[PDB]
Amino acid sequence: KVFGRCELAAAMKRHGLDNYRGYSLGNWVCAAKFESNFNTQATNRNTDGSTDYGILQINSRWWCNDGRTPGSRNLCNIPCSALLSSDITASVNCAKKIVSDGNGMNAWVAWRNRCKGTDVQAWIRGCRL
Amino acid sequence: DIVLTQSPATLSVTPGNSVSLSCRASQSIGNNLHWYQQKSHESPRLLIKYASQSISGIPSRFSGSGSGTDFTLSINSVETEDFGMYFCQQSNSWPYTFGGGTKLEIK
Amino acid sequence: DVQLQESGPSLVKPSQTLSLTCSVTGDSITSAYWSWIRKFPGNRLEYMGYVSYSGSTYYNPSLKSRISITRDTSKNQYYLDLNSVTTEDTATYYCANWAGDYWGQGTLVTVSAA
Description:
heterotrimer, A: 129 residues, mainly alpha, B: Immunoglobulin-like, 11 strands, allergen (chain A), hydrolase (chain A), signal (chain A), disulfide bond (chain A), bacteriolytic enzyme (chain A)
């Protein structure tokens, strides 16, 4: 499903992402926008054999198990296909684990290249939350 | 640090009644609140995560609800195996903290 | 099925370093985030810290930097070192995964001149 910006902001707020471990809500909307264009079914096959899944493009080498990625660690303890749902629950649970590492949101390459250092609260302005 | 206050500190109840325990946070923590049970001579057991998400292997009489600062754990029809301590825990901010606990015991 | 089990001394003296070990059986230590938690005598729980997959550590500031958590992939164990213990460090210590589903049985450590 393709979320609207304000729609996603209100959902991510409901899923407890506003100020989770020091990251204001706008970070998460901005990251979704550049990682997947707000599409919960987005998938991206990498050159190393892994695949990035869903709205936050969570990687099958470290985070979820898709059964086809060589040294998969399955850190979120979840099948990757659970991240391709229009309900964002599993993606948000996994993301909270990811961001609890000392790397924080630098795990998301598009966030790091297009969001960090910008006025990320601009992604939630103009929205009823 | 976020402080978590639970109440009541102790609740006595007859098997078969339904009870509700409360956990209040000193700041808004969204849905980042988990509930643990701790029976005598046992290590904590995770019952509910992220305020209301169910966990495989736990009786379905346990349910959780709330957001922001006010959270509740409900036990529909208490059984004798439910007696013990209940704690809430927030993982919104580092350091993670626990509430002071509620003791559930036979009335 | 993963199993966790704490070990170390049950009695230590004031000002020494307490060292505990958590052995993991069932999966590799590289597949989770790992933590230490302790329970004081009148049921107060304290989250001590955890180590995540990059090796970064988070420590509770109530410990005033006397703690260190390290892991050993080879032995599939991770450790707790607590320096300069006092009688206030008497407690039951548990290791558990960050997710909170797997906990060790807990070990009581008493701090006394003796």
